[PDB]
Design an enzyme around this catalytic site. Sequence first.
Site, PDB file in Angstrom:
ATOM      1  N   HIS G 126      75.616 120.823  14.295  1.00  0.00           N
ATOM      2  CA  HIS G 126      76.015 121.423  15.271  1.00  0.00           C
ATOM      3  C   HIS G 126      77.206 120.781  15.691  1.00  0.00           C
ATOM      4  O   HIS G 126      77.868 119.729  15.135  1.00  0.00           O
ATOM      5  CB  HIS G 126      74.889 121.397  16.650  1.00  0.00           C
ATOM      6  CG  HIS G 126      74.941 120.073  17.357  1.00  0.00           C
ATOM      7  ND1 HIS G 126      75.550 119.699  18.554  1.00  0.00           N
ATOM      8  CD2 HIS G 126      74.363 118.708  16.968  1.00  0.00           C
ATOM      9  CE1 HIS G 126      75.199 118.610  18.840  1.00  0.00           C
ATOM     10  NE2 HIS G 126      74.497 117.920  18.080  1.00  0.00           N
ATOM     11  N   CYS G 142      72.179 113.441  15.862  1.00  0.00           N
ATOM     12  CA  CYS G 142      72.336 114.534  14.816  1.00  0.00           C
ATOM     13  C   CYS G 142      73.498 114.756  14.105  1.00  0.00           C
ATOM     14  O   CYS G 142      74.524 114.150  14.637  1.00  0.00           O
ATOM     15  CB  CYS G 142      71.517 115.911  15.373  1.00  0.00           C
ATOM     16  SG  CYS G 142      70.175 115.679  16.586  1.00  0.00           S
TER      17      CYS G 142
END
Lengths: 4, 4, 4, 4, 4, 4, 169
Positions: G126, G142
């Site tokens: 993301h 992440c």
Amino acid sequence: AXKX
Amino acid sequence: AXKX
Amino acid sequence: AXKX
Amino acid sequence: AXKX
Amino acid sequence: AXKX
Amino acid sequence: AXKX
Amino acid sequence: GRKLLTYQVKQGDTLNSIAADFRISTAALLQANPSLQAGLTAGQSIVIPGLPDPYTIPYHIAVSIGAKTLTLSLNNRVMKTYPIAVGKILTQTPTGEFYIINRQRNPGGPFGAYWLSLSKQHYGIHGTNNPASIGKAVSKGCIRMHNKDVIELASIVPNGTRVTINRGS
């Protein structure tokens, strides 16, 4: 990662 | 991927 | 695991 | 709690 | 397996 | 997959 | 013929956790794979309802942990390479063969415009509100990319795309  |  |  |  |  |  | 995605499970992963991590319906998992309600067959390729075949996708994402970069290859040919951010959790997977399960469009929050859900909540990709955190290693975050990078990727690559998270060393 998880005995049996 | 990968063969055991 | 989690997400963002 | 995690829509989409 | 995976090809055509 | 697989009605068919 | 309906070529769908095939995920390989192991012995220890709870079915509920799999369904949750994949953001799919538990009933759908038992629908495509009626053996799951009986027992978890380690080494079996399960069918994921709603996910396309990862080999049919002419886009290969080669992630390099030690190089903090994402190599986007079109038809097995390197097209573009963008700098990414990875966490300690990313260094765990030596091969990191994961597939995109779904893509969230505009969450409204500082998620980075788009959110690419991988086969693992901590291995998802993301954007971010702080691009300065991209290109370096993070504690337990992440896979993070630039706002434009994730937008470009989400336009080029579809669902089921095979993301190979290689440490490089």
